[PDB]
Design a protein around this ligand. Structure first.
Ligand code: CB3
Ligand code: CB3
Ligand code: UMP
Ligand code: UMP
Lengths: 316, 316
């Protein structure tokens, strides 16, 4: 079955995994260096052993593809995956005249009442981002995020490079190119970034009329993070190809620090007790050809039968 | 035996390898996505089935480690690995008042007499770089090369970042860090680079008191290029550790386009007929502790018994 690599990945970390503390003071079992292979021509690799919100992946990907960096887009799509990053900025700023919110995300876990207040403030913040246009341009723009790194890389001359754009055009004009690379890592920016990109860089490739992509992930939360990444990128490879009049090849995921947080250990064996069922089929609108124009409705996922969703705590 | 991965790598490309043309119009057999593992604690991975010039690796690595970008250093070390890049610049410039040199590197293969003239001009150029100090600052500086990317990344504010330096310091102060990354890929520079870096990025890692490095190579010449890279980086991992008071872990090589040029096919089966013998031991001077100060004599390779060197044509 397609998704097997992920199960084999988890199962392996449990075994060869060596304990190793991390930033968020939770414990984690690690394996450095691992690469897995998914043949995107046998089915979409959206896990069936545990319900994963494809709707989220979808909207988040488009966001990036528009070179967009403001929250508003995701909010106008029910996506809150990036709230904390914007909300945090909002709390450490002059205007935030509310209750205590320092370390909100971590305190929420052992809330004195904090949960209800944080969850409510978030509504207040989100809403105004959504409505107060000036407020949005002030606290909804995260600034440096995958979209602006892929589509608006700021040069040393005050200009912007549309990496992804060109990579696409290049693929069309020189498909056998060895330098079809989009880079999310900027030596100057990470030194002061909240969360330096995890999906560090990816490389395109063509051969026998098929397109392939290799993502280099420096750090991954096997249980929580890794499933989303697979879908996110596996999709990109589908979209890009359609736009190139190319067949679909393989999604290759290379890892730096693949890890499994201790608090996750019980939920993961749980997943390993499940037997994966046939993998869903992705369907892309055949009329629209410029991916940058694809809208939420232009991507369909046929036959996604999955096991109930397994919950687990997030460690910041 | 240690070096086995490389043999297994070659053997594999020969098998699963799909024909694919490239820039230099030579044919090549490819495999996209491959990762190999070398446990740097069992021996130095300097191939024994074919004589590889460690002396060259050594000097070339130091060069980089000094954040140096001029040829002079390598010349003052018998290294000519980067001559063509500087020589080319010299030929397309106003001062080069000599014979025909356009496409020199490719014409050399089927020389009308070209070989002797090119080889002699190179002496003239090299010599003056070596001596005429002004000439050196003009044609010996390649400018953007691994050293200036590792040690002098130019920011959008006219400053320079010493990526590698910091990564080292970081390793010392936060060994369990997931962002120990040095990047050779700059979105602005490659668009006009002679040869965008092949050794794109690498990541450091620490655990159980051992240091590990994963190199992400976008494109590799299995026969000619890949052997050098192994040694080059496997060394760096040794040097960095010594400087960190760390044990040596593993060298992990991840590939984008691993390839074997057609003109190489005969020489490679030849190598596969050989049985590798025990791998050499690296010995680092125990007195010197700041790698940036290591000099050619501070690195020793004990017991390097190798099979005679296999020659093969270079395709630019
Ligand atoms: C793209 C991308 C990856 N990302 C980005 C991302 C960024 C920082 C991280 N930080 C940590 N500690 N672990 C992560 O998994 C992680 C992931 C994700 C972002 C949000 C959710 C999330 O909120 N999870 C859902 C549950 C989803 C599921 O597992 O079914 C939730 O609402 O609880 C998942 C992945
Ligand atoms: C670090 C690094 C990689 N590099 C850099 C590098 C840069 C561009 C390339 N371009 C192509 N076409 N193939 C390559 O192998 C290659 C390698 C190398 C640079 C020079 C030699 C070289 O001149 N070879 C020796 C023979 C060495 C041997 O194989 O034993 C010679 O003098 O013939 C080898 C590796
Ligand atoms: O697809 C993704 C994206 C991000 N993250 C995670 C990786 C780490 O768990 C955490 C960041 O910790 P650092 O790597 O920055 O140390 O965010 C994932 O798990 N999966
Ligand atoms: O260790 C190294 C460094 C560079 N190159 C090669 C890779 C390609 O053979 C050639 C560059 O072609 P492109 O990837 O740029 O297309 O230089 C290697 O083979 N090995």
């Amino acid at each position: 079955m397609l998704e097997q690599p992920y199960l084999d990945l988890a199962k392996k970390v449990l075994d060869e995994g060596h304990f190793k503390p991390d930033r968020t003071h939770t414990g984690t079992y690690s394996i450095f260096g691992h690469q897995m292979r998914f043949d995107l021509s046998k089915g979409f690799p959206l896990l069936t052993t545990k319900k994963v919100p494809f709707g989220l992946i979808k909207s988040e990907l488009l966001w990036f593809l528009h070179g967009d960096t403001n929250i508003r887009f995701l909010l106008q799509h029910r996506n809150h995956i990036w709230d904390e990053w914007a909300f945090e900025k909002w709390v450490k700023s002059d205007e935030y005249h509310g209750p205590d919110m320092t370390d909100f995300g971590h305190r929420s876990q052992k809330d004195p009442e904090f949960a209800a207040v944080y969850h409510e403030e978030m509504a207040k913040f989100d809403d105004r981002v959504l409505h107060d246009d000036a407020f949005a341009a002030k606290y909804g723009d995260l600034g440096l995020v995958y979209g602006s790194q892929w589509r608006a890389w700021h040069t040393s001359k005050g200009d912007t490079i549309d990496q992804l754009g060109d990579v696409i055009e290049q693929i069309k004009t020189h498909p056998y190119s060895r330098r079809l690379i989009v880079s999310a890592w900027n030596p100057e920016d990470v030194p002061t970034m909240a969360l330096p990109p995890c999906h560090t860089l990816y490389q395109f490739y063509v051969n026998d009329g098929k397109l392939s992509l290799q993502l280099y992930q420096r750090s991954a939360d096997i249980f929580l993070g890794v499933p989303f990444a697979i879908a996110s990128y596996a999709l990109l490879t589908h979209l890009v190809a359609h736009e190139c009049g190319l067949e679909v090849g393989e999604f290759i995921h290379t890892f730096g620090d693949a890890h499994l947080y201790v608090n996750h250990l019980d939920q993961i064996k749980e997943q390993l007790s499940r037997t994966p069922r046939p993998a869903p089929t992705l369907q892309l609108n055949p009329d629209k050809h410029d991916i940058f124009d694809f809208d939420m409705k232009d991507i369909k996922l046929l036959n996604y039968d999955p096991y109930p969703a397994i919950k687990a705590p997030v460690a910041v």
